[PDB]
Amino acid sequence: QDTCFLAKENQTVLKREGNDCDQRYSPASTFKIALSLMGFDSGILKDELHPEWPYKKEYELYLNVWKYPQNPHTWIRDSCVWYSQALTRQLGMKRFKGYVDAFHYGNQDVSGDKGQNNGLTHAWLSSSLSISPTEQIQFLQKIIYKKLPVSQKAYTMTKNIMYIQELPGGWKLYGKTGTGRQLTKDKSQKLPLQHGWFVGWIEKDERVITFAKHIADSKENTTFASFRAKNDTLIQLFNLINELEK
């Protein structure tokens, strides 16, 4: 049971729980936040509903809702892997590596699964790319304070499609879940052991609190780790809101 909860307002850390705050893991689908910033900054993504791309039979259909046409809004909401891969193939390796380095995203390793030049479409899917909760906070803070080398439209559009819901007191929740598989140390193969993320921020009036939650399982589990990560996070944020509103 390795976990980590971080919440941070501006330069102050409001919460820090668990032992794994500085351990790096595959971002899994939380990389879609970085992909949204690249997509809208490069001009390949146009707005929340464009471009819309068709489902192809070749795409693995791990979730049935991925069979529908996808646009940036549904991409985040459905966590559609094949949409991410269509986007990076248009970026190309040069631009994709450039953004990953310009963003200073974790270990910045985009080589992919050992033994296949598949980093462009697999680096974030329990492969080479790796990032810690502390680094997730840094990266999200660079989004909130516009400290990344992307355009205004990329900030605006990425924020729009990361919106989830309204929390008590009127705090708005923005975020992204991600579920990955742990790897063996030798040959680096994917295990049935899960790990999962929920990262993002809550916002009300002038105030923004970024957060990052991570869970690594020791045993198998019939539930996605990202859902357990997100389900715990909402309880932390509900109690945090109650403290902030005192």
- Helix H, strand E, coil C: the string for the chain is CEEEEEEEECCEEEEEEECCCCCCECCHHHHHHHHHHHHHHHCCCCECCECCECCCCCCCCCCHHHHCCECHHHHHHHCCHHHHHHHHHHHHHHHHHHHHHHCCCCCCCCCCCCCCCCHHHHCCCCCCCCECHHHHHHHHHHHHCCCCCCCHHHHHHHHHHHEEEECHHHCEEEEEEEEEEEECCCCCCEEEEEEEEEEEEEEECCEEEEEEEEEECCCCCCCCHHHHHHHHHHHHHHHHHHHHCC
Write phi, then psi, for 205 (nearest 5 degrees).
55, -130
CB 212 within 8 A of CB 25: no
| Cα 92 → chain centroid | 20
The C-alpha atoms of residue 16 and residue 211 are separated, in whole angstroms, by 10
The C-alpha atoms of residue 138 and residue 143 are separated, in whole angstroms, by 9
Q: For the chain, list the domains and their CATH numbers.
A: 2-244 (3.40.710.10)
Q: Six-digit token pair at 84?
A: 């991410």
Of the residues 26, 29, 36, 84, which is catalytic?
Answer: 29
Q: Six-digit token pair at 27?
A: 């971002």
The C-alpha atoms of residue 15 and residue 9 are separated, in whole angstroms, by 10
| Cα 200 → chain centroid | 8
Q: How many residues does the chain have?
A: 246
Is 127 an active-site residue? no
The C-alpha atoms of residue 9 and residue 7 are separated, in whole angstroms, by 7
Sign of CA dihedral 84, 89, 93, 95: negative
Entry resolution in angstroms? 2.3
